[PDB]
Specification:
The chain has three helices and three strands. The protein is an alpha+beta fold and 90 residues long. Helix 1 packs parallel to helix 2.
Length: 90
């Protein structure tokens, strides 16, 4: 499908923020019945910015991080947020 090389990396660069505490959640994984995995890039806000699927939690995570990363508006949203943060300790 539409998989990249450095999604979790690029994303982390794009949105990735100590305040956004973005992460990858595994909804599904490779199994005998279905050797596929699902992932959703959530954030400290408990909201899911991205969602990708792949053979494993990586390809999914990759696809997701990237997937969410593909979206600029959100990118510029989270970033703009970082700067638009009311209270920041880090």
């Amino acid at each position: 499908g539409s998989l990249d090389m450095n999604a979790k990396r690029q994303l982390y660069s794009l949105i990735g923020y100590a305040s956004l505490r973005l992460h990858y959640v595994t909804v599904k994984k490779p199994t005998a019945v279905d050797p596929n995995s699902i992932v959703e890039c959530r954030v400290g806000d408990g909201t899911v910015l991205g969602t990708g699927v792949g053979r494993n939690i990586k390809i999914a995570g990759i696809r997701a991080a990237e997937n969410a990363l593909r979206d600029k508006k959100m990118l510029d949203f989270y970033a703009k947020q970082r700067a638009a943060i009311p209270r920041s300790e880090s």
